[PDB]
Write a protein that holds these residues in place. Sequence first.
Motif, PDB file in Angstrom:
ATOM      1  N   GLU A   1      -6.789   8.589  -4.835  1.00 45.86           N
ATOM      2  CA  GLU A   1      -6.985   7.572  -4.221  1.00 45.86           C
ATOM      3  C   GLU A   1      -6.221   6.362  -3.802  1.00 45.86           C
ATOM      4  O   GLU A   1      -5.626   7.138  -3.025  1.00 45.86           O
ATOM      5  CB  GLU A   1      -5.714   7.413  -5.567  1.00 45.86           C
ATOM      6  CG  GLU A   1      -5.820   5.394  -6.170  1.00 45.86           C
ATOM      7  CD  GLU A   1      -7.320   5.520  -6.998  1.00 45.86           C
ATOM      8  OE1 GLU A   1      -8.039   5.264  -5.933  1.00 45.86           O
ATOM      9  OE2 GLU A   1      -8.273   5.501  -7.685  1.00 45.86           O
ATOM     10  N   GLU A   2      -7.738   5.527  -3.427  1.00 44.28           N
ATOM     11  CA  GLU A   2      -7.143   5.195  -1.788  1.00 44.28           C
ATOM     12  C   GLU A   2      -5.680   3.781  -2.481  1.00 44.28           C
ATOM     13  O   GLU A   2      -5.819   3.025  -2.763  1.00 44.28           O
ATOM     14  CB  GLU A   2      -8.431   3.924  -2.381  1.00 44.28           C
ATOM     15  CG  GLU A   2      -9.492   4.870  -1.241  1.00 44.28           C
ATOM     16  CD  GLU A   2      -9.375   5.650   0.434  1.00 44.28           C
ATOM     17  OE1 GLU A   2      -8.888   6.565  -0.273  1.00 44.28           O
ATOM     18  OE2 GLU A   2      -9.940   5.153   0.536  1.00 44.28           O
ATOM     19  N   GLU A   3      -4.758   4.503  -2.128  1.00 41.23           N
ATOM     20  CA  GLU A   3      -2.915   3.879  -1.513  1.00 41.23           C
ATOM     21  C   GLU A   3      -3.769   2.719  -0.780  1.00 41.23           C
ATOM     22  O   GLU A   3      -3.891   1.338  -0.152  1.00 41.23           O
ATOM     23  CB  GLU A   3      -2.598   4.830  -1.129  1.00 41.23           C
ATOM     24  CG  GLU A   3      -1.850   4.403  -0.205  1.00 41.23           C
ATOM     25  CD  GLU A   3      -0.408   5.013   0.514  1.00 41.23           C
ATOM     26  OE1 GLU A   3       0.843   5.561   0.179  1.00 41.23           O
ATOM     27  OE2 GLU A   3      -0.756   6.699   1.221  1.00 41.23           O
ATOM     28  N   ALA A   4      -4.802   3.470  -0.302  1.00 43.52           N
ATOM     29  CA  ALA A   4      -5.077   3.155   1.273  1.00 43.52           C
ATOM     30  C   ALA A   4      -5.779   1.651   1.051  1.00 43.52           C
ATOM     31  O   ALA A   4      -6.772   1.727  -0.046  1.00 43.52           O
ATOM     32  CB  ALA A   4      -5.277   3.809   1.954  1.00 43.52           C
ATOM     33  N   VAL A   5      -6.393   1.034   2.143  1.00 43.88           N
ATOM     34  CA  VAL A   5      -7.227   0.158   2.298  1.00 43.88           C
ATOM     35  C   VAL A   5      -6.620  -0.922   1.348  1.00 43.88           C
ATOM     36  O   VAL A   5      -7.486  -2.435   2.111  1.00 43.88           O
ATOM     37  CB  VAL A   5      -8.841   0.368   1.850  1.00 43.88           C
ATOM     38  CG1 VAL A   5     -10.152   0.254   1.929  1.00 43.88           C
ATOM     39  CG2 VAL A   5      -9.157   1.833   1.956  1.00 43.88           C
ATOM     40  N   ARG A   6      -6.440  -1.282   0.297  1.00 44.93           N
ATOM     41  CA  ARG A   6      -5.273  -2.169  -0.026  1.00 44.93           C
ATOM     42  C   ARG A   6      -3.983  -2.110   0.550  1.00 44.93           C
ATOM     43  O   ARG A   6      -3.442  -2.666   0.850  1.00 44.93           O
ATOM     44  CB  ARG A   6      -4.823  -2.331  -1.359  1.00 44.93           C
ATOM     45  CG  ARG A   6      -3.920  -0.414  -1.202  1.00 44.93           C
ATOM     46  CD  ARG A   6      -2.485  -1.123  -1.530  1.00 44.93           C
ATOM     47  NE  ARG A   6      -1.743  -1.590  -2.282  1.00 44.93           N
ATOM     48  CZ  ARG A   6      -1.179  -3.117  -2.158  1.00 44.93           C
ATOM     49  NH1 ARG A   6      -0.623  -3.286  -1.100  1.00 44.93           N
ATOM     50  NH2 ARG A   6      -0.306  -3.403  -3.252  1.00 44.93           N
ATOM     51  N   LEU A   7      -4.056  -1.617   1.442  1.00 43.12           N
ATOM     52  CA  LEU A   7      -2.774  -0.323   2.172  1.00 43.12           C
ATOM     53  C   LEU A   7      -3.660  -0.966   3.882  1.00 43.12           C
ATOM     54  O   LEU A   7      -2.737  -1.131   4.904  1.00 43.12           O
ATOM     55  CB  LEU A   7      -2.463   0.056   2.404  1.00 43.12           C
ATOM     56  CG  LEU A   7      -1.387   0.753   3.037  1.00 43.12           C
ATOM     57  CD1 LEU A   7      -1.319   1.797   3.616  1.00 43.12           C
ATOM     58  CD2 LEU A   7      -0.922  -0.198   3.952  1.00 43.12           C
ATOM     59  N   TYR A   8      -4.331   0.186   4.337  1.00 40.92           N
ATOM     60  CA  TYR A   8      -5.129  -0.040   5.533  1.00 40.92           C
ATOM     61  C   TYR A   8      -6.123  -1.018   5.871  1.00 40.92           C
ATOM     62  O   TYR A   8      -5.945  -1.536   6.077  1.00 40.92           O
ATOM     63  CB  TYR A   8      -6.366   0.714   5.571  1.00 40.92           C
ATOM     64  CG  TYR A   8      -7.674   1.706   6.533  1.00 40.92           C
ATOM     65  CD1 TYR A   8      -6.629   2.189   7.364  1.00 40.92           C
ATOM     66  CD2 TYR A   8      -8.104   0.738   6.651  1.00 40.92           C
ATOM     67  CE1 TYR A   8      -7.475   2.438   8.648  1.00 40.92           C
ATOM     68  CE2 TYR A   8      -9.279   0.605   7.760  1.00 40.92           C
ATOM     69  CZ  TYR A   8      -8.475   1.614   8.699  1.00 40.92           C
ATOM     70  OH  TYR A   8      -9.981   1.420   9.719  1.00 40.92           O
ATOM     71  N   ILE A   9      -7.097  -1.251   4.769  1.00 40.75           N
ATOM     72  CA  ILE A   9      -8.260  -2.891   4.947  1.00 40.75           C
ATOM     73  C   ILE A   9      -6.817  -3.907   4.961  1.00 40.75           C
ATOM     74  O   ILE A   9      -7.525  -4.513   6.132  1.00 40.75           O
ATOM     75  CB  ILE A   9      -9.348  -3.037   4.013  1.00 40.75           C
ATOM     76  CG1 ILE A   9     -10.355  -2.386   4.904  1.00 40.75           C
ATOM     77  CG2 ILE A   9      -9.050  -3.736   3.101  1.00 40.75           C
ATOM     78  CD1 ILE A   9     -10.757  -1.023   5.912  1.00 40.75           C
ATOM     79  N   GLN A  10      -6.247  -3.687   4.127  1.00 39.64           N
ATOM     80  CA  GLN A  10      -5.255  -4.436   4.358  1.00 39.64           C
ATOM     81  C   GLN A  10      -4.429  -5.088   5.770  1.00 39.64           C
ATOM     82  O   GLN A  10      -4.317  -6.110   6.286  1.00 39.64           O
ATOM     83  CB  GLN A  10      -3.849  -3.837   3.437  1.00 39.64           C
ATOM     84  CG  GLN A  10      -2.557  -4.802   3.433  1.00 39.64           C
ATOM     85  CD  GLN A  10      -2.857  -5.672   2.736  1.00 39.64           C
ATOM     86  OE1 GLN A  10      -3.312  -6.731   3.142  1.00 39.64           O
ATOM     87  NE2 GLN A  10      -2.640  -5.666   1.262  1.00 39.64           N
TER      88      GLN A  10
END
Length: 25
Positions: A1-10
Amino acid sequence: EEEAVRLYIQWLKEGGPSSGRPPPS
């Protein structure tokens, strides 16, 4: 699950203040 992207692309993408920030990676 993308913790990331809301975090990464963040980091960089669209709403991400890049150039002076450490990324998820």
